[PDB]
């Protein structure tokens, strides 16, 4: 089984968005009032699932085919997963989901008036390679109106989930597109206090990875908590 060999760099809770971020209304009632209780890392926290053996479908990472061709901006979303030390995270599970080109989600609860795309599902998943590289093929999602303030609109975004080597590293976040005017306005984006942190969530146009006369590309690297060996414990 797994073993307690690693220690993970402590999270920077001033970098990540805080719990209570009033402009994002839902956070009001969904944030603890009591302080998080700090505990030492043990086997429970320093291990996690390995998805190497999960049976991935041939088009798991291709939203263009995994659900007719979808209407919208053909793009490739690729990047690398590294830890804080710059060390690649091979064979890790990356999962993503988004709305269609008009900003509509293929979800029961979404009442937005933009129509669904008969050839679009919105879910993708893949395992990073030996160098920590991943890649997905999809369409650029559209902004989404939501009930926060009276005229709130989410920037075009793709939801991401990344496992990493332990439950200690597991992360859920969102990718935004370089230059989208809605970003600086988003209360959800704004939950993050450091403008520098904000910049980490913006996918950059990557002309070098685009397929001429076919699809454009965006680069999105993700960094997980640094993994070090225990010493003098």
């Amino acid at each position: 089984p797994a073993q307690d060999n690693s220690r993970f760099v402590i999270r920077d809770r001033n970098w990540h968005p805080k719990a209570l971020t009033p402009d994002y209304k839902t956070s009001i009632a969904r944030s603890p009032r009591q302080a998080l209780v700090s505990i030492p890392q043990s086997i429970s926290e320093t291990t996690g699932p390995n998805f190497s053996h999960l049976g991935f479908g041939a088009h798991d990472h291709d939203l263009l085919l995994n659900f007719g061709l979808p209407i919208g901006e053909r793009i490739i979303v690729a990047g690398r997963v590294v830890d804080q030390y710059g060390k690649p995270v091979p064979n890790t599970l990356v999962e993503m989901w988004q709305a269609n080109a008009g900003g509509r989600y293929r979800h029961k609860n979404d009442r937005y008036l933009a129509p669904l795309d008969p050839n679009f599902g919105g879910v993708g998943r893949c395992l990073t390679d030996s160098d920590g590289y991943y890649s997905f093929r999809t369409i650029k999602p559209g902004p989404y109106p939501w009930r926060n303030g009276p005229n709130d609109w989410r920037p075009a975004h793709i939801h991401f989930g990344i496992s990493g080597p332990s439950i200690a590293t597991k992360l859920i976040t969102q990718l935004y597109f370089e230059g989208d005017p809605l970003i600086p306005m988003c209360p959800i984006v704004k939950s993050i206090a450091n403008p520098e942190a904000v910049q980490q969530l913006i996918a950059k146009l990557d002309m070098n990875n685009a397929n001429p006369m076919d699809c454009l590309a965006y680069r999105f690297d993700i960094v997980l908590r640094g993994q070090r060996k225990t010493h003098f414990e």
């Binding site: 999270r11 805080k18 994002y24 030492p40 699932p49 190497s52 293929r106 979800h107 997980l224």
Partner: protein, 200 residues
């Protein structure tokens, strides 16, 4: 002082988490393989139990779009990290609350004991990560069992919670569901009886 590369900032899972992580719930067609709420196959060693609970917000209202991830040792107190649908037991699972009742269920086995970095055994526990809209960074918790009072008393982790009354918040209540042994574990995100959340 020294600085490493900064960790990618977290963001809420959003109300539609399900489309990506709980296909069924989203009400979408699933794939051949899906990570779900059945950690143990009927033929898995250990005491088969069912876990269930509700999630409450600060106003006492149910959180019906919550997404939970669990991590626990097997009956032998061993972490089975190689995730495989063929396995009789998987240490890792996923679940979500019903949009109706707002209750989550998990099918597993009572975990065996594991020791802390310092060689001290921790009471049987399930590690839980809670995600949902309105949650910017997922919340970490542990589920302990009320029938392990003895172990619980001595748990090095439980013992770090300064106020004894707050420890009680991490103890699942043994019950029976359809004549099957079950433990109920409600999470109170904010306010009165607010559940202890961990940082590690």
């Amino acid at each position: 002082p020294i600085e490493l590369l900064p960790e990618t900032p977290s963001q809420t899972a959003g109300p539609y988490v399900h489309i990506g992580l709980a296909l069924e719930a989203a009400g979408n067609p699933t794939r051949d393989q899906e990570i779900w709420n059945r950690l143990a196959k009927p033929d898995a060693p250990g005491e088969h139990i069912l876990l269930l609970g509700q999630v409450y917000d600060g106003n006492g209202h149910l959180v019906r779009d919550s997404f939970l991830e669990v991590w626990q040792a097997d009956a032998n107190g061993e972490y089975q990290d190689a995730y495989n649908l063929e396995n009789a037991f998987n240490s890792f699972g996923r679940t979500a609350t019903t949009f109706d009742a707002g209750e989550w269920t998990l099918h597993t086995v009572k975990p065996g004991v594991v020791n802390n970095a310092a060689g001290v055994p921790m009471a049987p526990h399930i590690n839980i990560s809670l995600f949902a809209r309105g949650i910017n960074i997922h919340l970490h918790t542990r589920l302990y069992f009320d029938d392990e009072a003895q172990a619980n008393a001595k748990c090095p982790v439980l013992n770090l919670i300064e106020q004894p009354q707050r420890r009680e918040t991490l103890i699942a209540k043994r019950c029976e569901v359809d004549g099957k042994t079950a433990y109920r574990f409600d999470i109170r995100i904010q306010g009165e009886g607010e559940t202890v959340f961990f940082d590690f």
